Amino acid sequence: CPAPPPGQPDIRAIGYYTDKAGSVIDPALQQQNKDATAPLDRYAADVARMSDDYLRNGDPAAAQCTLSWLGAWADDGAMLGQMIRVNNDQSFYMRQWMLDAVAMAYLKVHDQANPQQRARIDPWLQKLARANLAYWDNPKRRRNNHYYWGGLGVLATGLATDDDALWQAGHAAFQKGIDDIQDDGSLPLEMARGQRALHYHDYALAPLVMMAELARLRGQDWYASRNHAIDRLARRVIEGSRDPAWFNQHTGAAQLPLQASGWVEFYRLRSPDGGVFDAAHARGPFHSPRLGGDLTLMATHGIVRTP
């Protein structure tokens, strides 16, 4: 088990879109952001990977090393300080994505946590979750896909730490996202993203799918909400992956090509839909730390090894 890097209480991230539609990447701003957030993304990949190794192998050294890394950053009060604003709220967005990765990683190795590790990690995740919720109480921040990503970490913290209040807030974010699904399966706030509208429909669906998957650990069927409305979005996304024709004729910008993200590994098992997800499934792999790590592995073996 390698030594964890030091936990920084402050986040200093930088947005890299040039335009209003948040779709034209400034490659200078993107590199500046990637360097400034490199240790955060590096930590998220690591706890995702190690918690992957535990679910894959049963190996208790992978669980302990995950818990050791999480406890260290809890002790450091990592990300519990200043969210530095340069040009946008990219720092608040990183705090949502980082809670997502660390909470999901904590959930996957939680059965191996002793009461002393829990007493250190639980309050740290609960403070990040409350801070991520309180970010949205400002009525002038529009609740797009960021809100759905925010909800995933709050829900996983609510479930990991047995906090029913953070669990209900997680559901509230998921329900908001499901209620955004239009007749055509589009999301208005994601349709406004120009050449990345199709990207941001896949990007919005993934945390909704993972939140429905967490509710399934507790035996609830969130997929069924609003007469399976989520199926219209997942269905609209998988067809954009194949043929971007519908999206280009509704957006006023030629879509960049999209390979579906790893929500397909879970969703193909819940609503097979005659095998429309088969092509995406066969063209992985599907690793995203901010969604919990190895989505292929968690889809076939379970998000947790015991309830």
Numbering used by the authors: 23 to 329
Source paper text:
Unlike other PLs, Smlt1473 present in the clinically relevant Stenotrophomonas maltophilia strain K279a demonstrates a wide range of pH-dependent substrate specificities toward multiple, diverse polysaccharides: hyaluronic acid (pH 5.0), poly-β-D-glucuronic (celluronic) acid (pH 7.0), poly-β-D-mannuronic acid, and poly-α-L-guluronate (pH 9.0). To decode the pH-driven multiple substrate specificities and selectivity in this single enzyme, we present the X-ray structures of Smlt1473 determined at multiple pH values in apo and mannuronate-bound states as well as the tetra-hyaluronate-docked structure. We have built and refined the structures from residues A22-L330; electron density for other residues outside this range was either weak or absent. The structure is composed of 13 α-helical segments (α-1 to α-13) connected by 14 loops (L-1 to L-14) and two β-strands (β-1 and β-2) (Fig. 2, B and C (i and ii)).
In order to visualize and understand the effects of pH on Smlt1473 structure, we have crystallized and determined the protein structure at different pH values (5.0, 5.5, 6.5, 7.0, 8.5, and 9.0). The atomic superposition of all the crystal structures across the entire range of pH values did not show any significant change as a function of pH. However, significant rotameric transitions of important substrate-binding residues such as K42, K162, R163, H221, and R312L have been observed at different pH values. At the entry site, the residues involved in rotameric transition are H221 and R312, of which H221 has an altered orientation in all structures above pH 5.0, whereas R312 has an altered orientation only in the pH 7.0 structure due to a hydrogen bonding interaction with Y225. At the exit site, K42 exhibits an altered orientation only in the pH 6.5 and 9.0 structures, whereas in pH 5.0 and pH 5.5 there is no change in orientation; interestingly, at pH 7.0 and 8.5 a lack of electron density precluded analysis of the residue orientation. For K162, the altered orientation was observed only for the pH 6.5 and 9.0 structures; for pH 7.0 and pH 8.5 a lack of electron density precluded analysis of residue orientation.
